[PDB]
Amino acid sequence: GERSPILGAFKTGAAIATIDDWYPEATEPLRVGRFGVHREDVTCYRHPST
Amino acid sequence: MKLPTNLAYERSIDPSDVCFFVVWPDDRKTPLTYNSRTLHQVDFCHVPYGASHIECSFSVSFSSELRQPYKCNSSKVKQTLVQLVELYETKIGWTELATRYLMNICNGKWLWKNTRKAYCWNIVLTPWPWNGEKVGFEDIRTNYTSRQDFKNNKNWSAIVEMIKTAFSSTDGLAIFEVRATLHLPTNAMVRPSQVFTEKSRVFQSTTIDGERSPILGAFKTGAAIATIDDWYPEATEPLRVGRFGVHREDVTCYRHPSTGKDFFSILQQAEHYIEVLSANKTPAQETINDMHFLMANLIKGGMFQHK
Amino acid sequence: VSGQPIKSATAEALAQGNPHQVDFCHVPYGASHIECSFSVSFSSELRQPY
Amino acid sequence: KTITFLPCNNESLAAKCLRVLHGFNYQYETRNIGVSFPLWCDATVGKKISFVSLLKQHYFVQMEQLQYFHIYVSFRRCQSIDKLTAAGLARKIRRLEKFDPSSFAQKEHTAIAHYHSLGESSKQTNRNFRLNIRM
RNA sequence: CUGAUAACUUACAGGACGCUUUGGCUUCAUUGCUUUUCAGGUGAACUGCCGAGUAGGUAG
C-alpha cells in the first residue's frame, strides 16, 4: 500500500550493456550503442569520422 | 581559464541524519520525543526527568570522489583539475585538511548548541578499515581544547592516515561511526534543526521505532564538519566552506568577488598554481591557503558552470 | 554573461538564502541491510530482423 | 473608573496596575472588587482596564500627572496552562514521586484554546510567573 | 435658414403525405535525468500546596 523507489528498466539494462571497450583509445567500458557515447565527458567515441 | 557550460563534482564527505536517544539508568535506550502547540505551532524538545544522559549517532564517509570531475564537457578543463589534486598531494599533502575535518567530528562541533550547559561529553569512533578497540575521546570540555590535545591521543596518527589514504587512492572509502554521550543537567534545552516554512517552529523529524523523534539535518551535519574556512583576509572566525564564503550571523559575504578571493577567481588561476607547485622552493603561506581553500571546494562538490 | 561582477549582487544580497526542495531517501535507523530484486531474459532476438 | 491608556504596551502596562491591587489587598486585606476587561480583543487586552465593585493611590497619581490618563464574562486565573509548559511537567513528577518515571511520557500534540498572559513577579522572593487570564 | 414648409399604408390566411447506408481490417520496433544545499530569532512563564489522582484545583 505504499510508494517505493525503483531503478528504471532502462537504467538497469544500461548497466548490463557496459561492455564496449573496443573503441580506439580504450580504457573505460562504455554503454553499447551506435557511435558510442560517454556520458561523463560529453563526447562520442566511435564518431562517424573515425 | 574559462569555465565550461557543464561542470559538476560529487562530495567526498557524506554525513547522515543524527538520531537522539535517551539513556535511563538500568542502561537502556529510548528515542527522544518532542511537543507540538497550536492555538502557527511551536515544538519544544527537553530531556525527561529521570534520564541519565543522551546518545547521538550518525556516520561519515571520506569517499574521495574529488579525484576527478563528475561531468565536464571540455577536456582541457578536465585535464587541469586532475593535475591540481595530484600536485597538492605531492607538494603539500592531505595532512592539514584531514586534521581540520576530523577535529569537527572528534569534538562536538556537529552538536551545534546542545554542547552549551553540559557537564562532560565524550565521542567514540568506530572506523571501518580498522583492527579493533574503538577510538574514544573522553571529557572533551577539559581534556581536549587545543589541537595538540588531540594529537596526544594514543591513536591520532592511525585515523588521519585513513582520511589521507581515502583521498590518495582512486578507490578510497574510510567509513566512520560517531557516537556521543552528553551529560546534561536535569530537564535540559535541546535544539534540533527545523524545517523551512513560507511566511513558527517545526522541527525536522524522522521515525525511529513508530514514534516521532528530532533529527539533526543530514545537510545540517555536514555544514559543521566543513567549518574550516579561516583563510579570508583579516580572518577571526572559521566559516563554512563555500563559494564566496558567507557568514549567516552578520549577513555578509567575506571572500566577496570584489576581494578577488572567492572560489571562481581562484579557479581561473588554476594553471597559475601548477607552476608554483612544480618548483623546488616551498611556496608562501599566502599561496597555499589559496590551495587549502581550493581543495575544500572540490570536496564540497557543487556545480561550477557559466553561460 | 561577459565576465565582470554584476553590480546588483552586493555582499548582503549574495549571502542571503536559497530554498530548494529535493526527494530524500535513506536507510532506516536499525535496519540490517537492503534487498534488491529484478530479472533478465536472454531471448535470441538477434538471429533475424523483426 | 475605566482607565484609558493613551500614548503602547498595554499588555505589560495593564499588568503593573494589578501589582498595586496585589499590594493593596495586604494593607487592608479585602477581596470585594471585580476585574473587567471590556475590549478583550483576540490579539490584545485593549486600552481599557476597569475596576468594578484606586484613583487616589500612590502609583496612579504620578501616572495621572503626565498627559496620558483619564482614570456575563468570567476573567479567571487558569494555572492549568502553567503545567502545560514543559518546565512544569518535571516539577509535577517530583511532586508525584512522593515508582517508574520512564513510563511517564509527554503529550506531543497539544492545542491551547486562546489563553492570554500577563507577566509578573513575587516580592517575598525574586521569582517570576504569569497571570494566565481567559474568558 | 436643410430637393425648403406639410405627411397614419392598411386589412385576411393550415404546406403536407412516404422513406433499412451497408460490407471488410495487426500500428510498431529502440532508449541512463543528474550534480550541490544550516531556517533561525527557544537567555522567556517560576516553585511550591491539597488529593490515590499522568484528571482537576489552588498561592505569589
Contact (Cβ atoms closer than 8 angstroms) between residue B15 and residue B222: yes
Q: What is the CATH number of the domain that holds D9?
A: 3.30.70.2540
Specify the residue for cell string 581561473. Answer: B268
CA–CA separation, B172 vs B12, rounded Å?
Answer: 10
User: What SS3 state is found at D61?
Assistant: helix
CA–CA separation, B81 vs D28, rounded Å?
Answer: 86
User: What SS3 state is found at A33?
Assistant: coil
Q: Calculate the alpha carbon distances from B72 to A3, A11, B68, B81 in Å.
A: 34, 21, 10, 10
Could you tell me which residues are beta bridge partners of residue B59? Answer: B177
**A8–C contact, CB cutoff 8 A:** no
CA–CA separation, B122 vs B140, rounded Å?
Answer: 6
Q: What angle do CA B173, B176, B180 make, to 5 degrees?
A: 170
CA–CA separation, B212 vs C29, rounded Å?
Answer: 13
Which residues is chain A interrupted after (C–N above 2.5 Å)? none
Resolution for this experimental structure (Å): 3.2
Q: How far is B89 from chain A (nearest CA, A)?
A: 24
Contact (Cβ atoms closer than 8 angstroms) between residue B8 and residue B71: yes
- DSSP, residue by residue, B217-265: -HHHHHHHHTEEE--STT--S-EE--TT-EETTTTEESS-TTTT-SHHH
Q: Are strands D119-121 and D34-36 parallel, antiparallel or unpaired?
A: unpaired
Residue B19's CB: how many other CB atoms inside 10 A?
Answer: 20
In the 1-50 stretch of chain C, whose C-beta falls under 7 Å of nucleic acid strand E? 17-20, 22, 50
Which of the other chains make 3 or more beta carbon contacts under 8 angstroms with chain D?
B
Q: Calculate the alpha carbon distances from B53 to A46, B76, B98, D30 in Å.
A: 63, 55, 30, 50
D114 touches strand E (CB under 7 A): no
**C20–B contact, CB cutoff 8 A:** no
Contact list, B76 vs chain A (CB under 8 Å): none
Which of the other chains make 3 or more beta carbon contacts under 8 angstroms with chain B?
A, C, D
Question: C38 and A7: CB-CB below 8 Å?
Answer: yes
Contact list, B70 vs chain A (CB under 8 Å): 40
Burial of B155 (0-12, 13-18, 19+ CB in 10 A): middle
Q: How far is B7 from chain A (nearest CA, A)?
A: 10
Touch between C and D (at least 3 CB pairs under 8 Å): no
B70 touches strand E (CB under 7 A): yes
Contact (Cβ atoms closer than 8 angstroms) between residue B100 and residue B163: no
Nearest CA to B288 out of B98, B91, B147, B148 is that of B91
- DSSP, residue by residue, chain B: -PPPSSEEE--SEE---EEEEEEETTTEEEE-----EE---B---B--TT--EEEEEEEEEE--TTSS-SEES-HHHHHHHHHHHHHHHHHT-THHHHHHHHHHHHTGGGS-STTSS-S-EEEEE--SS--SS-EEE--HHHH-SSHHHHHTSTTSHHHHHHHHHHHHSTT---EEEEEEEE---TT-B----B------B-B-EEESSSSEEEEE-HHHHHHHHTEEE--STT--S-EE--TT-EETTTTEESS-TTTT-SHHHHHTTTTHHHHHHTSSSPPPHHHHHHHHHHHHTTTT-EE----
CA–CA separation, B170 vs B128, rounded Å?
Answer: 18
Contact (Cβ atoms closer than 8 angstroms) between residue B101 and residue B13: yes
CB neighbour list of residue B267: distance below 8 Å, 6 or more residues apart: B1, B3, B294, B304
Contact list, B78 vs chain A (CB under 8 Å): 41
CA–CA separation, B234 vs B100, rounded Å?
Answer: 20
CA–CA separation, B60 vs D75, rounded Å?
Answer: 57
Q: How big, in percent rounded to 5, are the helix, strand and coil portions of chain A?
A: 15, 20, 65
Would you state the torsion angle of the CA atoms of residues B81, B85, B91, B97, taken in this order, to the nearest 10 degrees? Answer: 130
**D113–B contact, CB cutoff 8 A:** yes
What's the distance, CA B15 to chain centroid?
8
B243 touches strand E (CB under 7 A): no
Question: A12 and C36: CB-CB below 8 Å?
Answer: no
Contact list, B206 vs chain C (CB under 8 Å): 29
**C21–B contact, CB cutoff 8 A:** no
C24: nearest CA partner in chain B: B218
H/E element holding D13?
A: helix D10-27
Contact (Cβ atoms closer than 8 angstroms) between residue D40 and residue D46: yes
A29 touches strand E (CB under 7 A): no
Q: Calculate the alpha carbon distances from B93 to A35, A36, B2, B210, B238 in Å.
A: 41, 38, 27, 47, 21
**Would you give the DSSP letter of residue D130?**
E
CA–CA separation, B303 vs B267, rounded Å?
Answer: 13
B248 touches strand E (CB under 7 A): yes
CA–CA separation, B67 vs B170, rounded Å?
Answer: 7
CA–CA separation, B100 vs B150, rounded Å?
Answer: 11
Contact list, A12 vs chain C (CB under 8 Å): 38
Domain of D111?
A: 2-134
CA–CA separation, B301 vs B245, rounded Å?
Answer: 14
A39 touches strand E (CB under 7 A): yes
Cα R_g (chain D), whole angstroms: 18
CA–CA separation, D87 vs B184, rounded Å?
Answer: 15
- DSSP, residue by residue, C1-50: --SSPPSS--TTTTSS------------TT---------------SSS--
- Our measurement of CA B221 to C1' E38, in angstroms, reads 8
Name the nucleotide with the smallest C1'–CA separation from D122.
E60
D94 touches strand E (CB under 7 A): yes
Could you tell me which residues are beta bridge partners of residue B63? Answer: none
- Our measurement of CA B178 to C1' E29, in angstroms, reads 54
**B125–C contact, CB cutoff 8 A:** no
Specify the residue for cell string 596526544. Answer: B152
Contact (Cβ atoms closer than 8 angstroms) between residue B190 and residue B114: yes
Contact (Cβ atoms closer than 8 angstroms) between residue B225 and residue B60: yes
User: Which nucleotides of chain E are near protein (any atom < 7 Å from a CB)?
Assistant: 29, 31-49, 51, 53-60
Angle B95-106/B218-225 helices, nearest 10 degrees?
130
Q: Calculate the alpha carbon distances from B198 to B41, B157, B201, C20 in Å.
A: 14, 47, 12, 12
Specify the residue for cell string 525574586. Answer: D126
Number of separate domains in chain D:
1
User: What SS3 state is found at D34?
Assistant: strand
Contact (Cβ atoms closer than 8 angstroms) between residue B4 and residue B73: yes
The three cell numbers of residue D90 are 518535571
